Structures are given as C-alpha cells and as structure tokens.
Curated annotation (Swiss-Prot), chains A, B, C, D, E:
It comes from Homo sapiens. InterPro entries: ATP-guanido_PTrfase (IPR000749), ATP-guanido_PTrfase_AS (IPR022415), ATP-guanido_PTrfase_cat (IPR022414), ATP-guanido_PTrfase_N (IPR022413), ATP-guanido_PTrfase_N_sf (IPR036802), Gln_synth/guanido_kin_cat_dom (IPR014746). Residues 2-26 are annotated as: Cardiolipin-binding. This is Creatine kinase U-type, mitochondrial. The modification Phosphoserine is found at S113, S158, S194. The lineage of its organism: Eukaryota, Metazoa, Chordata, Craniata, Vertebrata. One of its GO terms (cellular component) is mitochondrion. Residues 7-93 form the Phosphagen kinase N-terminal domain. Belongs to the ATP:guanido phosphotransferase family.
Length: 379, 379, 379, 379, 379
C-alpha cells in the first residue's frame, strides 16, 4: 500500500506561529530544525509536534520564561537532540550535553554541618523524581503503561522495612476519612490544573493509576504517576537537613535495590543524569530547601543579589495568598544538572547558613557583605 | 515484495539517442553516468529522465548551445550532481560547484557611479528569481504545490508598504480592462510557447495559480509561477541604475523578511547560491541591463569583441517588427554565478560607461581601443 | 526493488521461437497462455520456462512427435494446468484430466490367460515408475532432495523378505566386478545421453545418489533416481506374463506398505493417477511387453495396422540403432492413462495371443484379418 | 505456506561429493566456504550452486585440470569472490585479484617486429571476447537478454566502414548455400557438444539469437552468443602478426565506440580486466598464435621445456583422421591476466622467432639452448 | 535471511513415530493432516508440533487412552481444527463441533432434589475451569502473560463480599505456617509431576505467579495458574449437592461480573463452550461428584455396568492406605461437552440416588436391577 505520488503538506506548512512566544522551545526552533525532525519518530511513536505542543499552546509571560516542551519517553532526548540539547543548555546555563557529563552522588556521609538554627528554619525538605526504564513518560504513556508503573512501584515499596515501612493509597479508592487525613498532613495532590501540564497530556485518564505512599512516621513521601512516574520526598519540621538527606539517600538506594530485584531500572545516562519528563528536572532533578524566616533581610535591597550569588532561589511559602505571611520564604537550590546531589545539598547548607548569619547581624544593627559568587567554572 | 525472476530493461536500453544533439546535457551524459543515476530519485519522486527530457526533445543547432535540462526541486542538484555539476561548470565557464563557493551581496550602498548619460540609455532594469523552500519547481510541482507558492507569496506582498505597496492580479480572473492595462505597461506574460519550456512541463494547468504583482508607481514587478516560483524585477525609464538597484535590494530584503515571519525560506546554499529551475540562472540569477542607443558603435566590426572583453551580451530591444528603430540594444551582464550581485551590477555600470565613451569618440571622429579582458577566475 | 519506475521485459519479449518445432508443448503454447503463466511459481520455485526448456531446445522430428516439457514437482501439474492439460489430452488421445478420472487396479488375480506360447515369446516384462510425495522430481530436485529419495527407498527395500529380498548397489561405490556383473544381467543404466533428458536437467550431479536394486533371483529390478525417483520392473525369460504381473503387483504393494510405515506416500491423485516427471507416463506409467519372433508377419504390409487396432506398439531390441534384428520385436501396450493396469496387461495378453495367431496362419499359407479397432471395454 | 519455524536442509546436506574430482573448483571449495555462500544471490538471481554445477558434473581428467565453474553475470565475481578469487589465483598462477591490478593496452603501434618467416608460419591469428554490461552471460541469460545482446551488437557492426564493413548471418535463417560457404571459410560454429559447456547451460534455446559476422575481405570475424556475448577474431594467412594485431585493435576500438554511442559498455574492472564467462579468459581473454611447421624441434626432448620457458603452449592443428598430422602446430600465449595485450603479443612474437631459430639450427645438426625464462616480474 | 532458493526438510521428514502409541492424537494424525498443518501458526506463534508434543512423548497405556495434545491459546482450536475436531469427537463420544452447539446453563434454581442420604455420602463437590480471553494458556504463556492472569483474577477476587469474601496466597511467599494450614484443609497443590503435564510445558517457571484463594468459611476454592488459568471448586462435607451447586453458580457469576468491569472476558464460543487447555475439559469442564460409602454394592458384579448406564465414573478416595477403609469411592459425571451444567448435576443427583437405593436394597437381601441406559441421541 502506497500513494507515493501524492504530496505531503511541506514542513513549513505545519510550522507553528511563535511570533508572540517567550519560552526556550520557541527560542531554538527554526524552520531548518523543524523540517529535519518533523519526520522522525521514537520507537513508541512520539513525535516532534507532540514534544512542543505545550510550548505552542502556552506563549508564556514576558517576565517568566518556561521550557515549552516535554519528553514522551527515554528515546526522545536522543531522537530529537537537535532541539533538546540547545534548550537544555540554555536552561541549565551553560551545561552542554554534547560534550559534558553529569555525575551522581548519593553518599550522605560527605555532608558537613547540616543542622540549621531552628529559630529561623521552620522545616527542611529534599525532593527528586525517578522514571522506570522501558515505560513511556506521563505525556505519552497508555493506560496499561501507567498501570505497569504503578504495579512495579507499589510492589517495591511494600518491601521496605523499619523506619521506611509505610502504606499506599490509590486516589481512586481513597475514602473520605483517608482523603481528609492526607490533606491535613499536606501529602495529597490533585488533578493538574496548570495549562502547561494539561496541554502536555499529563492529566489523561485521571485518577486512574495515581497514588500516594508514605512511611509510618510521615517523613518519606512518594507520589505515583503525577508529573513523573515517581516524585520522592524527604521532609521534617526543624532544620536537621543532614538527617533529611541521609533518609533521602537511604530510601532511594533501598527502592532501587528492590526494583532491580524484579528486573527493572531507573532511566539514567551519563550525559543527562536521571531522565524525567521536563528538561528542567534533568541531572539530579533535586530541590533541597527550607522554610525560613528572614524579616529584616527581606527588606534590604541587597537580598536578591545575595540569593543570586549563592545560587539560591526564593518563592512563596506554598500556602501563599495575595502575600504569604511576612518574612517566611521557601529557599532552595537553583542548579539541577552538572552538580551532584551531594554538591547541591552542601551548597544549600552553606547558602542558608550565610543567610541566617545576615539576618542575625541585621538584628544587632550591624552591616553585611554581598558574598562572593559561587564559582561554578572549572576552566 | 517478493516474486521476481523476470528481468528489467537494462539502463542502456533506455539511453537517449543524442547523436544529432547540441546542448550541455548531451555533452556530459555518458552510458556510465546514465546507468549510475537512472535508479535514483528525489524525496518527491523526480528522476534523471525527467531532468533531461527537454534536452532530448530539443536537439538545437550549432549556432546556439542550450543547457538541455531542468531541476524539479531543491534536492535535484544534489541527488543528480554527477550530471549537473559538469553542466554547471561548462555553462558558468569554470565555476566548479564541488570546490568553489558563491557569495551573495545585496548591499546597494557599495555601488559607485550608477547614473548613465540619458541621451544614450533609454531605460534601466535588474531582474532575478527566487524559489520557496519545501515546494517543487515549475517542472514538477502539483497543482496544490503551485497554489501553495501563490498564497505564500501573495500573503507576503500584501504586507509591503510605502513605495513598495502594490496590487496583485490573477491571470484567471483578470478582466479585459485590467488585461489591456498590463499589456500597455509591458507587465503581462502569457502561456510559454518555447518548446524548451513546454517539453519541461512548465505550462501544465495554465493559467491556474499564475499571477502578476506590481507596486503603485510601477517600478517593481513580480511574476508568480511563470518560469520560476517568482521573477523579481526593478525597472525605470532613464539611466539611474543605482536607484533601480537600491529599490531591487530593498524590496528583496523586505519580501524575504515577510515570508520568514510565516515560517518560509528561499532556496539557497553556499555552493550554488539561489536555486532556480534552469542551471543557467544559478548563483544570483541576475540580469542587470539597459536599453542603449549605439548607432555609430553598432556598425563597427570591433563591437562584438569589446562586448566580450567587458563580459557583456547584447540582444534585441523587444521590437522584432524591423530593427527596433536601429542602433538600440539590450546590453546586460554575461556572468551569473561566482560573482556577487554588487559585483555584477558594478561590472555592468563600468562596461556601459565604456560603451558610451566609444560612441562619443566615433562621433567626434576619434578612434577606439578594444578594452582588455575583465576579471577572470584565472583562465 | 531497483525502481518501480523501471520497466520489466514484457512476457512476449521472453516468448520462445517455436516456428520450426514439432512437439506437444509447441502445439499448445500461445502468447495468451505464456503471459498468463510466466509469473506463476510452485511452492519450491519451479517455473513455466523450466517446464518447457527441453521442448524449446529440441525441435523434434516431423514424423515422431515428442512431448516437449517436464514436471518439476507434484504441484507443477496444478499450477501450470492451462498448458499441461491440453498436452496431456493430445498425448493420451482424448483423456481430459479436467472432467475424467483414472482408476488404479493392482489386483493380479483378475488376469485371465497369461501364458504365452514360448516358441514365439522369448521374454516378458512389466514396468512402471513411482514418485515420493514431498520431494522434487529429477528435473528440479537439489542434491539433498535426491539423497532423501535414496535414503527413503533403500530403507524400504531392505525390509523386503522371501523371494523379494535383495541387494542394493550405489553407482558411486560400485566395484568393477559388480559393475561387470550388472552389465551381463542387463540391469545397469548410465548417465543419460538423450538431449531430451539432459536439457531437462536430469543428469545433474551424476552419479550422486543413483543406485540399482534387484532381488536375489533376479526377477524384480528397481532403478533409483534415473529418470524418475524409482522405475520398478518385473521380468522373466519365457511367456508367463501372469506370473510376471503377480510379482509386479505384490512387490509394489509391499514397497508401498514399507514406506508408509515411515510416514511417506507415493505421488498420486484421481485425475492423473501416479505422478511422474514426463506427462507421457501419467496414470499407470505402465509398459507391459514381450520380446516376440514374428518372421513372416513382420514383412507383411498390414502389420502396422493390426498393431494399431490392437493398441500395441513395436520397437527394436537389437543393439546400437534398434530397428528389428530379424523377426524379433518388442511389443507393448500403447495406452497409459485412463485404463487400469489390469486392463492394460489383459489388453497386451489378448493382443499378443492374436498376433501369434497371425504368424501361425502365414506359416500355413492361410490369409490374415486386420482385427477391428478396440473400443472402450468397461471398468 | 512457508513457516520461518521449519528447518532448512543444513548447508552440508547439499554439499557436493567431490572425492573423485580434479578441477580448480573442487580444490578450493570447503564446507566453510559453501555454508557461507550458499545463501547469497546476485541481483538477477544467480547462485553458488549454479556457478559450480559444471564442475560437479565433470570430474575431469587426471592429466588436464579444468576450471570447473562459470559466471552467470558481472556481479558473480564480486558476490562469490571467496571462491572465485582462489580459483583465479591458481589458474593464472599467482595473480591475486585482491591486491593486484590488470592493465589493458590496445596500442598496436608499440609492436616491434611482427613479421614471421613465411616458410614456417602458415597463418596468424588473435582472438578475444567481450561482454555487454547489464546483460547476463550465456550460462544465465534469458531469451530476451540473449536477444538484446544480438540487437545491440548487430546495430553496431552495421556501422562499421571501409575494410571493416561486413555482413551478418543468423544461424536460424541461414540458407544451405550460405552455410556451406561459411564452412569452407572455417567461420561457422555449431551447437556446443563439450559437456563442460552444456552442463553450464550454454546451449539453451539453440540456435535462437546466435549469429556470425565477418568483414568483406574475410580477415575480421565475430561470433555472437556462442560461448560469450561476442568472440572477436583477427586472422590472415602468412606471418604478418603485426598487421593482424593492428586490425584487431582498430576493430575493437571502433566497435566499442559504436556501442557507447547507443549507451552500452563492455564489462570491465581494474582488478579483473574484461569480464567473460569462464575465469580462465579474464584480463585480456587473448589468444595470439600461429600455425607453424616445427618437424625437428618437435621430436627433440627439450621442446616442452623450451615452450614452457617462453610461456607458450601448443595444440593440434585441428586435423584428427587416423594418424593426426606431423610438424604443424598451433602455438599461442599461455598467459591471459596480469599482462597487457601488447605485452602478450610481443611475447608471442619473441617466442615464435626463437622457435624458428631452433629449427633452422636443428635443420643443420647444430645445437640449440634452453632460453632464459620469461618469468621475470618487476611489480 | 532465509534463502527461498534453499529447501526445507519435507513434512514427512518431521513426522513423529507413533507406531507404539495409544492416544487420541495418534489415532487421528495422518501424513496428509500433518503436511497440511505443519506450516500454520496462531497469532502468538503456537504450532502443530507444540500441540502434539505431549502426545508424542507419552505413548500411553494399552488399557487407558489419553488425549495426547494440548491447546496453546484460544485460536489453536480454530487454526488446527482439522486435528482437534476428530479428537474432540472421539473423546466426547459423538459430539461433532462442526455441526453441533453447546449450551451453558448456570441456573441452580432448576435443580430438583439434591440432598443425599448422609449415611452414604461423605462429601459433595463441583469443579470447573475458566480461561481469560487474550492471554495464552499454561502450555504457551510467557511469564508476563502468566503474571497478568494472576493480576486480573486477584483483583476480581478481592471484590467478592459476604460469604464469598476470602484471602489469597502466593505460593512464592507462603510461610510454613500458612503452607501447613493449606495442606490440612486439602487446598494446596504442588509442582505437576505427571509427565503428561510437564512434557506440555505446564510446569515452567514454577512457582512464579501460581496461587490459592478460598473464602473464609472454606467452601469455595480457586486455584490460579495450575493446569488452567483458574480451577474453580465448590465443596462441603455432607450431601447437600444442591447448596454446593448454588454457591458454585453464584460465585462464578460474581467473578465474571467483576472481571468484565475491568474489561476482561472468559474464553467461550458456541460450538465448544468454555475453552480450556486440555480438549477433554471443553464445554462445561465440569466434574460434579461425591465421596460415597457403598460396601455392599461395591462387591456386586453388576456395579460396573450400572455405572456405565448411568454415565458415571468411579475412582479412588485419596490418601490411599491399604488398612483404613474400603467401599469409599469418588463418583462423578462422565460427560462434559454437549450437556449443560444443570443437566450434568441433575444427572449426577439422579445417578447417585439410584446408587443409594441399590445399596439399601442389598442391606435387606433384596435384588436390584441394572438401570436402563441414560442415553440421549441426536444423530
């Protein structure tokens, strides 16, 4: 079967209108790249148009630049490398996946210090994501694939013991009692509403095969099939970041051991580290942060320059209204790819300690100095 | 695909009888090249036989050597390079597309002089052609493809402003009034009659999707889907070649800007310059010329040689009822590939000024010298 | 897969030149039939051209008409039925394989009479052939297939007992002593020399896998892989045709029993009877005959006719160019398909008894009568 | 009904029994080579078994070793190189087609001397063969392909002029008068009888598409579709080898010119020279020889060695009868590949002159000496 | 890369040696059937050889005749119908799957009577099997397919409520305590040892994905992935066959409802009823029986004939000990296909009651008659 003589609409006839757009995808797509890749496909059928759909549907904001594209599976990053690499490089400022390598380091014993002054730090948490090799990512997976991811993770989790032992809840058969309890613990998540996510097809078949798992002492949380196969979280009230990270590393090694026992692996490669659906979460996909009170320093205009030089970012206390509380922020690492998880946590520990010291000095009517930029350059 | 003990006609069985032919194609086709390429095809199905058909159908005469082959699409020049390169090299005397590069230069500000003596130069004009990447050329395009060229080009032209603003006319819905007006302005073109063109399939579906566009002041003309996707022309009565060329360059840059806004590009590459359907128009595809009154000089036997050394060619005024009026010729550049458009216009300006000088000498009874050979590629 | 754009040689371009030919194949091949079948193939790859090659290579004589085509395997008769049926019908005068059926009858007990006057009949013999289902015939079999026929038959022959017990000899490892003995018994056969056979590829790989088998009392002979998988022969000096035929039938049933025990069958179907490589040997593939002395009758001018009405044929026996070395002839049945083996042997018995009677008459000076043609007996 | 789960007879099951064979093919075929190539095929379907069939069918003679295999088409030599190369190397003693190159030289002007003493040399002749690229060789060509060869060659020969002008005769429509004339001139050839040729399928469809062509003065002979597409021969009574060779070279260049005009070429490549059906005729496929009288030299015991050292071979004049013929031999070059045709003719000229010299000496009882061997190699 | 020029071993070369065999498969396989089906395959790749392997490996007992073949998937019964139909017909004495239909009836309310005299009947049970459509049967399923059957069934069972609520046990993670408990209840099963089963590949990957499920009151048992996807059993001490059958029908309808809710179905068709791996269990795959004490009637010579006429069969008790008790048998229905489950249970109820009356008559020295044959004819 073949029409062969009939004409396909040429590539340019399908080119998206990105004239009013502001996202990484739009900054790197060109007619040449589009024509070169519009015919390619991954083994499971994911296409270039499907990668960029969310970026076409969401022009963005002029003050905030989004990525604008998602991966459908592991092969996506290779097949469509001509578009993904430039985007990855811009997003992780400088990291070139074509000539550089990412190194993973989950040895919590290398952390020094790690115990924050608890009259400033309310809570500490470390988050990451993992993908199960051989199954499509949230944007492209079929119902059977999504159900396979859930069966695999749940069997592994049920093998955890000691302080990692826990319970799993399926959103589809969760009772009102359980549902309420999870909301109180701040462990529940719901159907994505962000159009950046729904346009990428990440809310299909909801709530089929999504679930929540946490250990009995409520310090280790795992989300199944939300915006990635799994989102792994270690949290605690207080400022013992070191202990939070040790539990984080221990749980991850234990979970990986258990799935390898049944023949599965995490998606990972040496140039991109752990593979996740959004290019912004490549490498370590790690967010180590604290909820900290900085009432005085938050008024000083050198604050932004301080955060920037320490490679830290701030955001509303999650439970943000028009204006979240007053002086309470969510501070976490900026970088994600090109630095190990040990290096990133250490960087957050050093940065937060410096921030606390600034706030204590402003308290004694003293003066502070802008810290010297965290190098981040070998040659 | 399976069963096949039946034999195909060998390549030589299809070889054309070129014993009485006189064109570039015939001078370079050999049994070896034919056998090597008769099986190849471009992505849209164009074949070697289709490239050379016009050359087989039109033998020629020994007094004029024709090219003898056309391109069906952009890929043609690469897939069938073993035949096209030798032809291109002979036609553009020396230019070797395998080791040389063509440079484009549309900076009218580099033009020196440019104002001819108006008692010799009646009119000035500069012409070229452009192809829209992704769509087949006139010899091979389907109706949908041809209709595509027209809507893309027409969308662009309607965005021109100022002295470049104009009007478009479709030959298929042109009224008798409009038709008459266009004939008076010398802007109309009709169904090709040259067998070199009809044998190449360039008159199919006439007049579907062909049209004419000109600015309001009638100094910028564009022909759609005639012997190329577009033929762009800048003209004026008089001898202000410089102004004619500035408008030419300005309009081309504006038109290119406008089609890139909608995702389209011109066919171009560094070894062949702009891609057009006939190999003789590669590079700049430029014809810069004047209508000049050379009554005295035209009777001198040296005239042919002077032209040759200045790399200029002459032809009839456009009036084949008598001898035009007598002494009026169309003088334009000979070269097309391997020299920028700025270099070619400058060369015409210098050559015409020298031609004018010769005329003025014969007037006062002075003698003239045959200029010395112009800029070569080292021959 | 060179190019669906390149042309195949049309059927007529491959049509054989049969203008000077005289064989059944040439009398029935037409452009229409050739075009219709030249693309067809049997499961093992046998083609129309391979079927008729021998008929193209051997034009034949205007007096004696040969068949002109062979079968490569059992399926050949069905796939190429449009050519084979007409040929079969002409050759077996009238038998139409499309509407008629052949009946096999190996019940020797039905034979009446069968003991010839030994002063006229020197020897009696009955011959036939058998093909092993699932293996290609001599014209098409590979070496492995031919070897398989040998392994299969030889295993069955070694299971014969009593007066059917015998010995097998491979032509390839036969000693000079054995060879000389077989020549004296008239049991040896050599490489085919007839161009009707070599052009049909029946002498390939000689003498690989060909052999001879005979019972101890030398009255049952079997040839392996000569001009058929097997040629089975029952012979005796004298005129006890009845005994010769009982041994023939007994041996065949025993051999068939033995190969079926190992899972093999003879090629046979109800419209064509036993399948053999030459269409002339279809049905029973049987030749029942005697060596008889007809001094006086031989020289009568009606001889050719009495034979004809009795449906008998005569041939030489003598030596180099078998003609008729003095009143001694080889008389045997003419028909082969459409009559059972019992009907054919009975017909030879009745015919020879009658022929003898003509001789006895001529000897006594009495006159002879041309018998009336034999019209269909019954079943 | 072909299952990919059913087993193919393994390669060794098809291996030929070559235990009693004596030919180049048998000396180089091994189970490993057979298994490696038995699955390969040329674009037109020629197989390994078809290449070697003649070698399997003809064991050979303990005295003279034959090649034992033929090529079906040009690609055969490449696809089955693992068997052909070793054979080619043994046959052309040393020439390794994997590391060496053959050079063609048809410049007759380089010939020094070339006029033999006509008291010893009765006649001189030079022979070779040529294949038309794109058409199968005699062992494999279909009727349509064989007919193509004839049409292409006959059209070209009809374009020859002057002393090369001639006439063509088709064996199939040759009159008895014409046949007899050709026999008297010794220009006719008939159906091959050599089993080395018939087993290789070279007598199929005889005499369809075979023919004879000669120039008017009867000094240039061409055989069409006999044991190669064409066999080209230059001959003359007497000993003017130089003139015979000039005509040979002139006619070949003229014929090649003429077929290239219609798009065809000769089969040729740099490692094997001209490609012909029998590996023994590769390179130049040239036989330059004379019919010479050597009564004394022939009875001397040093003859076989004199011939050997001069790289010449002898054979009968072609007259058997009852007691053959004395003193007249056919002497020609031994080598064929790895030396140009100019080098080979020169070698024959030098060798024959030396042979005449040993005779004139023996004719006077004098002594002669073994010449130093031509077997010197520079590169 | 399977060269279609090469020959496959003919079908007869692979034919099994069944001369000493005694099973249904051997009684119906013929060379014709084998050749016709040896090339066919099911969509998942199951072949004829795989169907019959167990029958070839196990010749059987001259006394007891086994089926000798298994199905690999649902399509098997259709693709290989030419062998299966004859076998099915012999095994279910008369039932012709080509012209007859099977009717299913699980309406327990139609049962009349059903309460056996508990001084004779120790226990009552009804068993059957079910296959999940879309997944291969035990002989052919991969590990993933087998695990899928476990996944599906288990979810369905966990949805059962009331007196059907239960617990599931995986053989692979069963504790010694649980094992022992299951052995005491007579609910455990182990790795198959019967060579009829292991030769059919039904013990592969043991104990991966096999499990046991039973309701809390221990009256409903389900075996997962043993000799079928599921074996469903209803049992009770005593003789309330009616209640046992009502629970049987209720549980089956509930289980079917639950798997259809998730998109799955049971393998079923109108000519064969429920599809299971052994042809002997087609139709209803039902075994309704009792453990009955019949000491007096187990001595009468007529007993066997009585069983036969009532279409009942007997077998040993269990935990066999040549001490404990005699007179205790396992009596159940003989028929399986061609009668509804309601008709079969009713038939067992009537037959067993007749066997109780008979015993009692014999406890009063009275005489008993041989019941008239419970025959239902159609043909």
């Amino acid at each position: 079967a073949a029409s062969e003589r009939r004409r396909l609409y040429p590539p340019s006839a399908e080119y998206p209108d990105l004239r009013k757009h502001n996202n990484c995808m739009a900054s790197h797509l060109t007619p040449a790249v589009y024509a070169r890749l519009c015919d390619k496909t991954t083994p499971t059928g994911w296409t270039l148009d499907q990668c960029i759909q969310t970026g076409v549907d969401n022009p963005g904001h002029p003050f905030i630049k989004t990525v604008g594209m998602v991966a459908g599976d592991e092969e996506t990053y290779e097949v469509f490398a001509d578009l993904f690499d430039p985007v990855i490089q811009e997003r992780h400022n400088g990291y070139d996946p074509r000539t550089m390598k990412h190194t993973t380091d989950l040895d919590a014993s290398k952390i020094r210090s790690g115990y924050f002054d608890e009259r400033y730090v309310l809570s500490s948490r470390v988050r990451t994501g993992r993908s199960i090799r051989g199954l499509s990512l949230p944007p492209a997976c079929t119902r059977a694939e999504r159900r396979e991811v859930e069966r695999v993770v749940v069997d592994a989790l049920s093998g955890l013991k000691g302080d990692l032992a826990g319970r799993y809840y399926r959103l589809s058969e969760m009772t009102e009692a359980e549902q309420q309890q999870l909301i109180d613990d701040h462990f529940l998540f719901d159907k994505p509403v962000s159009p950046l996510l729904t346009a990428a097809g990440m809310a299909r078949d909801w709530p089929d095969a999504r679930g929540i798992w946490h250990n009995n002492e409520k310090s280790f949380l795992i989300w199944v099939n939300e915006e990635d196969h799994t989102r792994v979280i270690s949290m605690e009230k207080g400022g013992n970041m070191k202990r939070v990270f040790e539990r984080f590393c221990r749980g991850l090694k234990e979970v990986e051991r258990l799935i390898q026992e049944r023949g599965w692996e995490f998606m990972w490669n040496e140039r991109l580290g752990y593979i996740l659906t959004c290019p912004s979460n490549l490498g370590t996909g790690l967010r180590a942060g604290v909820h900290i009170k900085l009432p005085l320093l938050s008024k000083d205009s050198r604050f932004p320059k301080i955060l920037e030089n320490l490679r830290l970012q701030k955001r509303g206390t999650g439970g943000v209204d028009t204006a979240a509380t007053g002086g309470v922020f969510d501070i976490s690492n900026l970088d994600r790819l090109g630095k190990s998880e040990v290096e990133l946590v250490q960087l957050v520990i050093d940065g937060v300690n410096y921030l606390i010291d600034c706030e204590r000095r402003l308290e004694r009517g003293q003066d502070i100095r802008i810290p010297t930029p965290v190098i981040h350059t070998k040659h």
